Amino acid sequence: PKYLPGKHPKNQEKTPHVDYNAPLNPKSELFLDDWHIPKFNRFISFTLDVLIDKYKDIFKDFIKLPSRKFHPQYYYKIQQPMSINEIKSRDYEYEDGPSNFLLDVELLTKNCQAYNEYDSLIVKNSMQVVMLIEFEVLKAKNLKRNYLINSEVKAKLLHYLNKLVDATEKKINQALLGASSPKNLDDKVKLSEPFMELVDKDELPEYYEIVHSPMALSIVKQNLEIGQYSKIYDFIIDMLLVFQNAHIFNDPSALIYKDATTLTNYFNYLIQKEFFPELQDLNERGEINLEFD
Numbered sequence: 001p002k003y004l005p006g007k008h009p010k011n012q013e014k015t016p017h018v019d020y021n022a023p024l025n026p027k028s029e030l031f032l033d034d035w036h037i038p039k040f041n042r043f044i045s046f047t048l049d050v051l052i053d054k055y056k057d058i059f060k061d062f063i064k065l066p067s068r069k070f071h072p073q074y075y076y077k078i079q080q081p082m083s084i085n086e087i088k089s090r091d092y093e094y095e096d097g098p099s100n101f102l103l104d105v106e107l108l109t110k111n112c113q114a115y116n117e118y119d120s121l122i123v124k125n126s127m128q129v130v131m132l133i134e135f136e137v138l139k140a141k142n143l144k145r146n147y148l149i150n151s152e153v154k155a156k157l158l159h160y161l162n163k164l165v166d167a168t169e170k171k172i173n174q175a176l177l178g179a180s181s182p183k184n185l186d187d188k189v190k191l192s193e194p195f196m197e198l199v200d201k202d203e204l205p206e207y208y209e210i211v212h213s214p215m216a217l218s219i220v221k222q223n224l225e226i227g228q229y230s231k232i233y234d235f236i237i238d239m240l241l242v243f244q245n246a247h248i249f250n251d252p253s254a255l256i257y258k259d260a261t262t263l264t265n266y267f268n269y270l271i272q273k274e275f276f277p278e279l280q281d282l283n284e285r286g287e288i289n290l291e292f293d
Helices: 040-054 056-062 084-088 097-115 121-141 151-166 169-180 205-210 217-226 232-249 255-284
Strands: none
Touching: 040 056, 040 084, 040 097, 040 121, 056 121, 084 097, 097 121, 121 205, 121 232, 151 217, 151 232, 151 255, 169 255, 205 232, 217 232, 232 255
16 A cells, blocks of 8 residues: 555644634535434434444544654644544533534544645545534434435436536536626536546556545446435435545646536536426326335
8 A cells, every 4th residue: 555544744833723613515405404303412422423433443543542652743833632532422412512523523534634644545544534514413403304215216326416517617617607697608628527527547556545435427327227225315425425425535726626626616506506496396286105214
């Protein structure tokens, strides 16, 4: 491996200040919607235990606090050290619990990025730790619209998948800015191009060292067909996984990283502004079976 495990300290004179209160994505529905899960503390320990079992070798450097014995200077540079054990020991059953839980979870990557070189296995793993926890929260938060994927829901989800796949810079800006969209924007190149297939293991072996749950749009499409996704949010998470992995792997200045952001925003737009209101419209006129478990 080119990416060796454990810490890779920056060792710089002025270590960056970690803003506890700034969410990684301040526009995330997880921070803007008022939601609470009954018995949130039980949900947290259950969810965190499942994730640790399923992803041991990603979660493992984040379970306990960094060792003061081996890394004493961690405690001089990091103002609010955090771990999964610490999060599990806390009470989040009060009014700001949900967002304090999320900000506590984000500290895991924020601290990691403050202490360690950006391009290191440990940093990319901290990103994935946060991503995966936030995926479970997103699903649970959306219980009341996390309908079973029966035949007609599947057809609707295919429709919006195809629509995203075919989206060009012109289509997206139109949708996202409307009457404020700049003119002369490209209407031939599909932004999804580089997200359709998995990069070859032989041409880019480090991809698979870094990205622990690889996912491509053609695979999401195959999975939807065969019945891998039983609820709407199983499909949504995998879609979000495609673009998020590009944020994990690529440099923030890379054009593919930018396209991943754009396609994430367009996808959220399609789900929130087209797909769910359509399901509701169909439901109100008796045309679709919307159901839970």
